[PDB]
Design a protein around this ligand. Structure first.
Ligand code: JPB
Ligand code: ZN
Length: 104
């Protein structure tokens, strides 16, 4: 029902807020360092700290620029916030295995 940061327990998001971007909330992707991420898309999230300036470089989602999303509490890299696109303008792509699911 809710998703917390796996490292410290910070409240991050909810199952109800999963978003099927391109028909699926799950997207498996790699960055230029070859790191594989299983990214779940969410319409909304909280408890994050978004860092740096948005960048389109290597964006996995056409038309969106990303900013890195850290856990606001412990600093763990939890994913990205996506903006500058259309339908929707913004969303979060969070790394599934950095989250823990549990009761509200
Ligand atoms: O949509 C995205 C987000 C994802 N970005 C990254 O992994 C990334 C890059 Cl490329 C550079 C730095 Cl300095 C830090 C990070 Cl976290 C990517 O490659 N495509
Ligand atoms: Zn945390």
């Amino acid at each position: 029902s809710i998703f917390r940061c796996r490292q410290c327990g910070q409240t991050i998001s909810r199952r109800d807020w999963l978003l099927p971007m391109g028909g699926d909330h799950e997207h498996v992707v790699f960055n230029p360092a070859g790191m594989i991420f299983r990214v779940w898309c969410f319409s909304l999230a909280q408890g994050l700290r978004l860092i740096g300036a948005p960048s389109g470089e290597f964006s996995w989602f056409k038309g969106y620029d990303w900013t890195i999303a850290l856990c606001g509490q412990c600093g763990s890299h939890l994913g990205w916030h996506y903006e500058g696109g259309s339908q929707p303008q913004t969303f979060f792509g969070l790394i599934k295995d950095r989250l823990a699911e549990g009761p509200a």
